[PDB]
Amino acid sequence: DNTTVFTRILDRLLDGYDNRLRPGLGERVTEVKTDIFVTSFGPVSDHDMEYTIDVFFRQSWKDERLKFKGPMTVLRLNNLMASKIWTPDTFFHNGKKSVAHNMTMPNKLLRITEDGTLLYTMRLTVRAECPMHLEDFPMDAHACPLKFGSYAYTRAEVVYEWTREPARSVVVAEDGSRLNQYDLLGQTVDSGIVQSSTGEYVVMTTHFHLKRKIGYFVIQTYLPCIMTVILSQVSFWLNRESVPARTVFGVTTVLTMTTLSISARNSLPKVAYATAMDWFIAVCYAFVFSALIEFATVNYFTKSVSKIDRLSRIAFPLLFGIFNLVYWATYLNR
Amino acid sequence: DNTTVFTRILDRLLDGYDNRLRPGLGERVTEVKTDIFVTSFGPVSDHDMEYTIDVFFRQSWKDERLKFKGPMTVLRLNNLMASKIWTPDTFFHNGKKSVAHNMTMPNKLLRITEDGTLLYTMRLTVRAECPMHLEDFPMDAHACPLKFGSYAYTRAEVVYEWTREPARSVVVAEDGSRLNQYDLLGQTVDSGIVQSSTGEYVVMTTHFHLKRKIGYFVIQTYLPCIMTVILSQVSFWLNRESVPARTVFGVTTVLTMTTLSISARNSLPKVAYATAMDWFIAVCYAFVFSALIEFATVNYFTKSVSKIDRLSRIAFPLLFGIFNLVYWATYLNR
Amino acid sequence: ASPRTVTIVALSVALGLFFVFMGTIKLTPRLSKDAYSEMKRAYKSYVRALPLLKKMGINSILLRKSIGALEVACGIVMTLVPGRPKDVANFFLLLLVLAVLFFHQLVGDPLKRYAHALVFGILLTCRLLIARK
Amino acid sequence: ASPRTVTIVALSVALGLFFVFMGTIKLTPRLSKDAYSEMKRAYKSYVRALPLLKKMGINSILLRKSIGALEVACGIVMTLVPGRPKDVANFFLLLLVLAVLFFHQLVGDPLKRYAHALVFGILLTCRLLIARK
Ligand SMILES: *[C@@H]1O[C@H](CO)[C@@H](O[C@@H]2O[C@H](CO)[C@@H](O)[C@H](O[C@@H]3O[C@H](CO[C@H]4O[C@H](CO)[C@@H](O)[C@H](O)[C@@H]4O)[C@@H](O)[C@H](O[C@H]4O[C@H](CO)[C@@H](O)[C@H](O)[C@@H]4O)[C@@H]3O)[C@H]2NC(C)=O)[C@H](O)[C@H]1NC(C)=O
Ligand SMILES: *[C@@H]1O[C@H](CO)[C@@H](O[C@@H]2O[C@H](CO)[C@@H](O)[C@H](O[C@@H]3O[C@H](CO[C@H]4O[C@H](CO)[C@@H](O)[C@H](O)[C@@H]4O)[C@@H](O)[C@H](O[C@H]4O[C@H](CO)[C@@H](O)[C@H](O)[C@@H]4O)[C@@H]3O)[C@H]2NC(C)=O)[C@H](O)[C@H]1NC(C)=O
Ligand SMILES: CCCCCCCCCCCCCCCCCC(=O)O[C@@H](COC(=O)CCCCCCCCCCCCCCC)COP(=O)(O)OCC[N+](C)(C)C
Ligand SMILES: CCCCCCCCCCCCCCCCCC(=O)O[C@@H](COC(=O)CCCCCCCCCCCCCCC)COP(=O)(O)OCC[N+](C)(C)C
Ligand SMILES: CCCCCCCCCCCCCCCCCC(=O)O[C@H](COC(=O)CCCCCCCCCCCCCCC)COP(=O)(O)OC[C@H](O)CO
Numbered sequence: 001d002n003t004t005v006f007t008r009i010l011d012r013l014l015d016g017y018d019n020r021l022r023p024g025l026g027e028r029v030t031e032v033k034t035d036i037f038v039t040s041f042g043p044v045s046d047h048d049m050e051y052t053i054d055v056f057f058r059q060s061w062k063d064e065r066l067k068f069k070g071p072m073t074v075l076r077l078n079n080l081m082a083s084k085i086w087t088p089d090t091f092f093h094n095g096k097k098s099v100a101h102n103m104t105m106p107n108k109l110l111r112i113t114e115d116g117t118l119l120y121t122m123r124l125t126v127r128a129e130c131p132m133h134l135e136d137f138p139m140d141a142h143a144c145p146l147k148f149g150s151y152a153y154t155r156a157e158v159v160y161e162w163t164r165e166p167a168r169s170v171v172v173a174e175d176g177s178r179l180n181q182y183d184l185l186g187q188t189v190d191s192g193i194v195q196s197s198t199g200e201y202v203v204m205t206t207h208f209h210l211k212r213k214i215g216y217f218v219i220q221t222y223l224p225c226i227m228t229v230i231l232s233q234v235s236f237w238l239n240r241e242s243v244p245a246r247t248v249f250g251v252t253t254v255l256t257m258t259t260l261s262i263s264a265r266n267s268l269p270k271v272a273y274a275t276a277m278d279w280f281i282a283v284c285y286a287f288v289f290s291a292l293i294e295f296a297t298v299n300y301f302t303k304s305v306s307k308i309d310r311l312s313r314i315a316f317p318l319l320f321g322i323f324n325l326v327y328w329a330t331y332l333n334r
Numbered sequence: 335d336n337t338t339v340f341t342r343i344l345d346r347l348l349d350g351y352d353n354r355l356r357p358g359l360g361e362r363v364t365e366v367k368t369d370i371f372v373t374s375f376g377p378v379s380d381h382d383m384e385y386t387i388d389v390f391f392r393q394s395w396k397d398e399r400l401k402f403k404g405p406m407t408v409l410r411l412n413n414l415m416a417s418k419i420w421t422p423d424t425f426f427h428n429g430k431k432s433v434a435h436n437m438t439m440p441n442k443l444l445r446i447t448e449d450g451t452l453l454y455t456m457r458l459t460v461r462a463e464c465p466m467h468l469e470d471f472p473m474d475a476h477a478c479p480l481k482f483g484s485y486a487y488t489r490a491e492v493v494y495e496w497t498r499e500p501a502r503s504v505v506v507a508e509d510g511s512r513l514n515q516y517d518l519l520g521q522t523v524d525s526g527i528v529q530s531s532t533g534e535y536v537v538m539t540t541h542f543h544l545k546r547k548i549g550y551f552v553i554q555t556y557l558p559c560i561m562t563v564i565l566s567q568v569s570f571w572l573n574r575e576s577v578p579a580r581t582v583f584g585v586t587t588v589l590t591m592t593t594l595s596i597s598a599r600n601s602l603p604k605v606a607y608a609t610a611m612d613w614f615i616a617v618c619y620a621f622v623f624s625a626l627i628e629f630a631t632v633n634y635f636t637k638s639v640s641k642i643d644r645l646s647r648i649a650f651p652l653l654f655g656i657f658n659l660v661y662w663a664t665y666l667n668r
Numbered sequence: 669a670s671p672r673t674v675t676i677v678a679l680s681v682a683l684g685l686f687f688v689f690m691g692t693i694k695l696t697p698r699l700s701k702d703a704y705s706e707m708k709r710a711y712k713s714y715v716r717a718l719p720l721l722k723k724m725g726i727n728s729i730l731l732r733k734s735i736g737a738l739e740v741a742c743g744i745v746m747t748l749v750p751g752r753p754k755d756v757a758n759f760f761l762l763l764l765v766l767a768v769l770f771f772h773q774l775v776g777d778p779l780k781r782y783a784h785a786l787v788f789g790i791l792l793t794c795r796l797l798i799a800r801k
Numbered sequence: 802a803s804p805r806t807v808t809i810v811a812l813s814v815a816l817g818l819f820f821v822f823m824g825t826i827k828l829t830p831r832l833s834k835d836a837y838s839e840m841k842r843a844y845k846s847y848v849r850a851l852p853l854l855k856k857m858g859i860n861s862i863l864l865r866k867s868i869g870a871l872e873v874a875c876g877i878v879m880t881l882v883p884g885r886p887k888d889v890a891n892f893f894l895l896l897l898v899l900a901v902l903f904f905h906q907l908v909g910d911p912l913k914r915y916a917h918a919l920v921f922g923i924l925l926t927c928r929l930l931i932a933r934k
């Protein structure tokens with residue numbers, strides 16, 4: 001008995017229904033309200049400059065052709081019904097019009113309210129391009145965009161709006177973070193317009209603001225280099241008559257800095273521009289090299305405690321300390 | 335005209351065909367010849383102890399029910415025909431009977447020869463478990479298995495054999511390597527039997543022999559540690575009357591080794607057992623610590639060049655050199 | 669008194685006070701049962717990670733007792749007994765910290781676990797440098 | 802003659818022979834056109850990676866000429882002219898290698914690129930240590 005009543009309702013809805021025509025194609029503009037729940041923010045691939053994200057993508061719109069009256073005010077139907085009616089062809093595209101990789105599960109819930117409002121949500125895994133500027137690496141931040149919109153309908157036919165306040169229309173799960181070496185500080189939600197060869201389209205954009213975590217590189221590179229620079233300056237306190245010992249000191253320390261420098265970029269991709277870390281390593285290398293050069297000058301004048309050593313005991317620590325203050329203040333105050 | 339002739343052939347083959355019964359279910363054992371072409375050996379995930387592989391999986395067998403005679407001796411048909419006939423339910427399983435992740439593309443070529451021989455190949459991406467023993471890390475090697483067989487048919491019903499010589503039945507593409515920190519030395523092909531709760535099954539196995547590349551860790555950890563140990567022993571050549579300088583030397587060098595040790599395992603997973611690298615770092619730490627302990631002893635007897643320093647100049651370099659010979663010979667001769 | 673006279677006593681007492689406290693943990697769990705429970709786990713791994721140590725009949729129990737015995741014996745000496753034996757105790761502790769640091773680094777424990785030993789290692793040697801004028 | 806007398810001459814001549822050879826590359830591509838083509842690329846990056854260097858009107862061409870000019874001037878001096886000026890040239894080269902090594906490390910080039918400069922840096926200073934008895 002119950003099935004017969006619902007079978008008639010479905011037949012009535014599809015009787016004379018033309019899924020080839022969008023609602024309001026001749027009367028008004030179809031307004032689609034959208035919101036995104038990020039179930040997990042997948043890992044970031046620096047080599048490919050891309051990132052993965054798993055979301056519950058929810059879309060809602062009104063289609064007056066699907067009005068009905070019956071025992072229930074809302075029809076929670078199987079997702080199979082979605083393929084039988086017209087739905088927006090929304091897709092996630094990286095850049096201007098290139099659709100990004102999409103993996104949609106078969107389940108796509110469809111709920112029709114008696115008023116004719118439709119709720120249509122799907123589970124998607126989107127891999128998107130996130131170009132990165134690594135000039136400030138490892139103290140850099142990136143805004144990874146997520147852009148989507150209509151493929152075929154221009155702004156004069158379909159417009160997208162956020163279901164609620166734009167900030168509250170994109171929600172990130174509390175424990176969905178899959179980032180290893182990045183911290184998700186937040187995201188900004190915005191919308192814009194793109195004019196392509198096929199026309200003008202509405203694009204909904206969200207930027208996820210990521211900040212690199214420096215802890216790994218502080219332990220791996222910066223700290224060993226700082227101790228090496230400090231270690232090299234201890235030579236100024238040794239007596240000038242220990243030429244074999246201090247020469248081995250200078251050469252060995254330069255070798256250590258060379259080894260540390262080689263392993264620092266072993267992991268990073270071969271980018272043409274120089275990063276902030278390279279500048280720090282290069283300056284430290286100069287200090288270690290200069291420490292040995294100072295001894296060579298001292299030995300040349302060895303016939304009393306060298307005046308060059310006494311001054312180097314102050315100039316070298318002072319300049320290096322000043323350099324750290326400017327370097328860290330420059331890349332952290334931002 | 336051509337379509338009509340081929341339509342009749344297909345109808346004749348399917349006339350009275352029972353796809354529920356394997357060929358030879360009452361006369362003989364169905365022999366299936368298999369070979370694998372590895373198009374790419376995907377990356378290895380140490381954290382998950384798994385690996386990915388993309389292959390063209392080819393299977394061939396004879397089904398006398400599909401004999402035919404016509405203008406062509408071989409029918410290169412659409413893969414849709416495969417679903418309409420009986421095919422082996424071969425799957426890739428990790429361990430004993432747990433089917434591993436499989437991603438098969440829609441295309442599954444089917445070719446039927448006039449003799450009744452069938453060729454059935456499919457494109458698969460298999461993620462498989464590869465348990466790793468990291469005792470010899472980073473000088474370790476692993477044999478990652480790839481096991482597959484019938485899910486429902488026992489050895490008394492279905493048996494798998496290699497199409498040709500077992501070594502030549504598994505071919506790896508020359509440029510298919512997707513390994514970053516591993517080297518694929520080769521693979522060994524074998525077959526065995528597994529007795530499960532549901533019966534006894536034939537399992538075809540291939541082991542891929544992987545060897546870790548030590549170059550990254552030599553630059554990152556071993557070399558800085560070796561130079562630090564050498565650097566610490568330079569103190570024995572400094573005069574005993576430089577207590578402030580040599581104390582800073584000892585403390586600073588110990589700090590550097592502490593920093594290097596912390597960053598060495600920063601990347602490795604938290605495994606309970608100790609690796610080969612840990613032993614090397616621990617021994618180097620003792621040498622650096624002992625260098626400072628030697629000076630403390632020397633200062634205690636400072637009222638002439640210390641006899642302890644003269645002996646330490648030989649004992650310390652000698653023991654460390656011997657330790658390297660035993661360590662590297664132990665983990666490389668294998 | 670002179671800063672050197674005051675400073676040496678504080679380090680000598682403090683290190684013996686702290687090291688004897690550690691030695692008690694490895695022996696008697698009365699002060700902290702949880703500490704002994706975790707401590708025995710650490711020494712189980714060390715011997716298990718030093719086969720030859722266990723190939724000569726030496727077990728973790730014998731290892732745990734010996735280290736605790738020497739730390740307390742040397743810790744009290746550095747607190748009460750003056751003179752040359754006081755410095756001799758300091759050297760022996762210096763010969764155990766590296767062994768402790770050779771075990772923690774032989775299992776890859778984080779800094780927090782072995783930070784305390786390293787800090788006192790610097791102080792332990794620093795005290796020896798100020799043993800006498 | 803004495804090993805020191807022979808050794809110093811070889812290093813002094815060789816370094817001046819090699820460094821003048823490098824200075825020619827940065828100036829005249831006749832010896833190796835390919836070397837100059839790649840060399841100018843390196844110095845384009847260095848200034849581009851040192852804005853303030855380019856904010857004072859200093860371009861790569863001026864930078865390339867200056868370094869090449871000093872290396873050849875100091876390289877020939879270390880080969881022919883004896884006495885104190887010979888050692889002064891050595892110090893100036895020591896003051897340029899770090900600048901070269903401060904540029905290569907400021908762009909993250911591999912070891913092979915800047916290995917030659919580092920090796921001669923050790924020899925260049927070693928020669929100075931044996932400047933006189
Ligand atoms: C992302 O999600 C989509 C949808 O689920 C996946 O399928 C792709 O959907 C697109 C629409 O959203 C399709 O355009 C695309 O395939 C298109 O095929 C057109 C030709 O039509 C033939 O093929 C389709 C698909 O098999 C078939 O249904 C149809 O009956 C025909 O046989 C092409 O014209 C079209 O090309 C478009 O872009 C090119 C860019 O150069 C233009 O030149 C064309 O004019 C045109 O605008 C397109 O190829 C669907 N593709 C597939 C494989 O299903 C995507 O696969 C998902 N992304 C990923 C990465 O998987
Ligand atoms: C690997 O490749 C396979 C094949 O393409 C993918 O699909 C799985 O195929 C298996 C056979 O090779 C199926 O067993 C498995 O689903 C099974 O479903 C049985 C119940 O049948 C219902 O569901 C199926 C699938 O939707 C449907 O066709 C059928 O009409 C019924 O509605 C289960 O009994 C079976 O469980 C088996 O293992 C459990 C282990 O505990 C036993 O207890 C059971 O007795 C039984 O032996 C199994 O679940 C197919 N699964 C899916 C999702 O399609 C796999 O998905 C591929 N792997 C991966 C990781 O995707
Ligand atoms: C003239 C000589 C000058 C010598 C100056 C020495 C200065 C200090 C030297 C530094 C060496 C140690 C650096 C450690 C950095 C990391 C600390 C850290 O993160 O500690 C905690 C948490 O720390 C924090 O969250 C930040 C702590 C900030 C405060 C640090 C204070 C340091 C004081 C040093 C005093 C030195 C005095 C020397 C006197 C001779 C977590 O431990 P991890 O290091 O992560 O342990 C390893 C874990 N894993 C392998 C899995 C990665
Ligand atoms: C008493 C003092 C004792 C001092 C002893 C010093 C011993 C040598 C010190 C070692 C420091 C350098 C270590 C370099 C290791 C890597 C070399 C290497 O791989 O070189 C080539 C290729 O080398 C090989 O294939 C192997 C070479 C083996 C032979 C090495 C000979 C070394 C001789 C050293 C002589 C030192 C004399 C010192 C005298 C005072 C490739 O260059 P990369 O290092 O990969 O460049 C970086 C690239 N990337 C950042 C992208 C990773
Ligand atoms: C003559 C001696 C002078 C000594 C001067 C000392 C000045 C004070 C500094 C002393 C040592 C500081 C050591 C700081 C360790 C920080 C470790 C770390 O990872 O810090 C991160 C915070 O970032 C930093 O600390 C950045 C580096 C700070 C500065 C480091 C150098 C010291 C300051 C400059 C010294 C200059 C010495 C000049 C000598 C002449 C925290 O990371 P996170 O919480 O974002 O996530 C990490 C992740 O979860 C894994 O754990």
Ligand SMILES: CCCCCCCCCCCCCCCCCC(=O)O[C@H](COC(=O)CCCCCCCCCCCCCCC)COP(=O)(O)OC[C@H](O)CO
Nearest residue numbers: 547548549550552553556560564650651652654655658662
């Ligand atoms: C008083 C001074 C004594 C000095 C004694 C010196 C003895 C000879 C050693 C000199 C330095 C050797 C430097 C070797 C660098 C090797 C770099 C490397 O990566 O080597 C790998 C080969 O493996 C090794 O070389 C392993 C380490 C060898 C030994 C390193 C230490 C030196 C020997 C022991 C010295 C002991 C000193 C005692 C001092 C008292 C190659 O990797 P791959 O080809 O497999 O792939 C790498 C990847 O593609 C990225 O490039």
Ligand SMILES: CCCCCCCCCCCCCCCC(=O)OC[C@H](COP(=O)([O-])O)OC(=O)CCCCCCCCCCCCCCC
Nearest residue numbers: 286287290293294297301306307308311312315316319896
């Ligand atoms: C990027 C550029 C890096 C440059 C690094 C240079 C390192 C070496 C510097 C050597 C400077 C001195 C050269 C020799 C001058 C001279 O005549 O010295 C002899 C006398 C002292 O004689 P005696 O008392 O030793 O017998 O000397 C005197 O009477 C006067 C001595 C003055 C010494 C001044 C030292 C200044 C050190 C500054 C270090 C800055 C490091 C910056 C690193 C980025």
Ligand SMILES: CCCCCCCCCCCCCCCC(=O)OC[C@H](COP(=O)([O-])O)OC(=O)CCCCCCCCCCCCCCC
Nearest residue numbers: 620621624627628631635640641642645646649650653763
């Ligand atoms: C895992 C264990 C690590 C142990 C590390 C120990 C490091 C410190 C070793 C100190 C040994 C000496 C202790 C003091 C003995 C003594 O009486 O010394 C005074 C006299 C010398 O007096 P003076 O001539 O200096 O006035 O002394 C003498 O007349 C005799 C001096 C003999 C010195 C022997 C030195 C042996 C060094 C071996 C180093 C092995 C390192 C192994 C690292 C794993």
Ligand SMILES: CC(C)CCC[C@@H](C)[C@H]1CC[C@H]2[C@@H]3CC=C4C[C@@H](O)CC[C@]4(C)[C@H]3CC[C@]12C
Nearest residue numbers: 134135136274275276279849850851852853854
């Ligand atoms: C050889 C001497 C003169 C060099 C002096 C360098 C001085 C002027 C400093 C001041 C500001 C510095 C720059 C600040 C920021 C960056 C971005 C970084 O991604 C690479 C290094 C680079 C480009 C620095 C290079 C060195 C620099 C230009």
Ligand SMILES: CC(C)CCC[C@@H](C)[C@H]1CC[C@H]2[C@@H]3CC=C4C[C@@H](O)CC[C@]4(C)[C@H]3CC[C@]12C
Nearest residue numbers: 468469470608609610613716717718719720721
């Ligand atoms: C404190 C003193 C006595 C320690 C002496 C250690 C000597 C005996 C050496 C000889 C062989 C060595 C072992 C050889 C191999 C391994 C496997 C590695 O994954 C961890 C270290 C470990 C387990 C070594 C520990 C140290 C060891 C036992």
